[PDB]
Design an enzyme around this catalytic site. Structure first.
Site, short mmCIF file in Angstrom:
data_model
loop_
_atom_site.label_atom_id
_atom_site.label_comp_id
_atom_site.label_asym_id
_atom_site.label_seq_id
_atom_site.Cartn_x
_atom_site.Cartn_y
_atom_site.Cartn_z
N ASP A 1 -23.89 7.09 -10.31
CA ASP A 1 -24.46 5.91 -9.65
C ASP A 1 -23.61 5.56 -8.43
O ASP A 1 -22.43 5.90 -8.37
CB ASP A 1 -24.58 4.72 -10.61
CG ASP A 1 -23.26 4.29 -11.19
OD1 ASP A 1 -22.38 3.89 -10.40
OD2 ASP A 1 -23.10 4.36 -12.43
N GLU B 1 0.79 -1.23 0.00
CA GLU B 1 0.00 0.00 0.00
C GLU B 1 0.82 1.27 0.00
O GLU B 1 0.43 2.26 -0.60
CB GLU B 1 -0.89 0.04 1.23
CG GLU B 1 -1.56 1.38 1.42
CD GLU B 1 -2.67 1.60 0.43
OE1 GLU B 1 -3.68 0.87 0.53
OE2 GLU B 1 -2.55 2.49 -0.42
N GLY C 1 -25.39 7.97 -16.00
CA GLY C 1 -25.23 9.10 -15.09
C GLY C 1 -24.82 8.64 -13.71
O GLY C 1 -24.84 7.46 -13.41
N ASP D 1 0.95 3.46 -3.59
CA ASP D 1 0.57 4.87 -3.61
C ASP D 1 1.65 5.79 -4.21
O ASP D 1 1.36 6.64 -5.06
CB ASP D 1 0.24 5.36 -2.20
CG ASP D 1 -0.89 4.58 -1.58
OD1 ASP D 1 -1.23 4.85 -0.42
OD2 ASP D 1 -1.43 3.70 -2.26
N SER E 1 -7.21 1.73 -3.54
CA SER E 1 -6.02 2.42 -3.03
C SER E 1 -5.19 2.97 -4.16
O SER E 1 -4.38 3.87 -3.98
CB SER E 1 -5.12 1.47 -2.25
OG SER E 1 -5.83 0.87 -1.17
#
Ligand SMILES: [Ca+2]
Length: 357
Positions: free
Chosen positions: A338, A78, A336, A82, A278
């Site tokens: 959701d 993670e 559109g 990133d 992530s």
């Protein structure tokens, strides 16, 4: 189907990222509550992508430091993911990774720290951690919410993945829950999709949903936060949970997150493939880094502006649901906005076009 993968540059291409911009003059802060990042893997990736490595810096908050566990299959994943996705797409900017104890207070102190950081002065903040909004201590959520609001009124963008467990967000109480911080209305909530694109076009792109075992994008109707005024023409449906009730819908935008079409990264020396939401906050954190650049000013809070921008600024995801708990099909995507992919995936170019004076 067969599992594929893209590098971070390919997906940017897919979403027509504004070329000729790299984040120079910009500074991205990334929140990390565990694990660390090793400089061998980073330099190897930035070279492997034929990109000049961006400046990476760590900032200790409440004790926490850069503490890699060597396990490419653990937190480091993670943390490096990133920085890799973000740094590869906006190599020009300056990364400022903030590490803090994984507590309600370390998470909070980290955000407020970066947000008001006078040395690195980040204009954007990327968060890929979170949790059911109904599992956080109320005082925590309100504290952080204000932290974000304070962020907005400071000209700082705040992005955050919407989760990796579908509409139920990993809770077996039989109800539906959305994820915080993603539910915070002052946050640009990033959901996930399964993109099939090539250098010149997006062949297909559906809600990311790999069942219980594979994960699925978090999304739905907040039960804590009222319906934003700017999100009132988005047609956010009411919650599917018995009792119903209006709520800030989640997410706002979406981007590729399906591991089965994951990202190719370099974690702790190992060349593997990661996915999940992530990857999407930093994915779009880099987007905003380039847009701030061309503009010469922080687009700060983008949510109000985004919800009233015209159709051609977004690719609309209409197929799929993020229900990995039952056959009810909640929440299901459609034309559109959701509760799976929000406005859909952005088209950088048309989005920068839309924002210049
Ligand atoms: Ca849609």
């Amino acid at each position: 189907a067969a599992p594929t993968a893209y590098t971070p540059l390919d997906v940017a291409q897919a979403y027509q990222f504004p070329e000729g911009l790299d984040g120079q003059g910009q500074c991205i802060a990334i929140i990390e509550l565990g694990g660390g990042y090793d400089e061998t893997s980073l330099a190897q990736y930035f070279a492997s992508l034929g990109v000049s490595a961006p400046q990476v810096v760590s900032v200790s908050v409440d004790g926490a430091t850069n503490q890699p566990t060597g396990d490419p299959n653990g937190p480091d994943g993670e943390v490096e993911l990133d920085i890799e996705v973000a740094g590869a797409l906006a190599p020009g900017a300056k990364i400022a990774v903030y590490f803090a104890p994984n507590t309600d207070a370390g998470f909070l102190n980290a955000i407020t720290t970066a947000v008001h950081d006078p040395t690195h002065k980040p204009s954007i903040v990327s968060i890929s951690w979170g949790g059911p909004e109904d599992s956080w201590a109320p005082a925590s959520i309100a504290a952080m919410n204000r932290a974000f609001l304070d962020a907005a009124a400071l000209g700082v963008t705040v992005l955050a993945a919407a989760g990796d467990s579908g509409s139920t967000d990993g809770e077996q109480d039989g109800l539906y829950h959305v994820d915080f911080p993603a539910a915070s209305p002052y946050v640009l909530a990033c959901g996930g999709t399964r993109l099939v694109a090539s250098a010149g076009r997006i062949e297909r792109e559906t809600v990311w949903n790999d069942g219980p075992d594979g994960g699925s994008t978090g999304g739905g109707v907040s039960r804590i936060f009222p319906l934003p005024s700017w999100q009132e023409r988005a047609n956010v449906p009411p919650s599917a949970n018995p009792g119903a009730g209006s709520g800030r819908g989640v997410p706002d935008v979406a981007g590729n997150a399906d591991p089965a079409t994951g990202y190719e990264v370099v974690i702790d020396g190992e060349t593997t493939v990661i996915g999940g939401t992530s990857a999407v906050a930093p994915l779009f954190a880099a987007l905003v880094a380039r847009i701030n650049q061309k503009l010469g000013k922080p687009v700060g809070y983008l949510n109000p502006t985004l919800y009233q921008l015209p159709p051609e600024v977004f690719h609309d995801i209409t197929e799929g649901n993020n229900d990995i708990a039952n056959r009810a099909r909640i929440y299901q995507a459609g034309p559109g906005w959701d509760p799976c992919t929000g406005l859909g995936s952005p088209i950088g170019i048309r989005l920068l076009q839309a924002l210049l004076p």
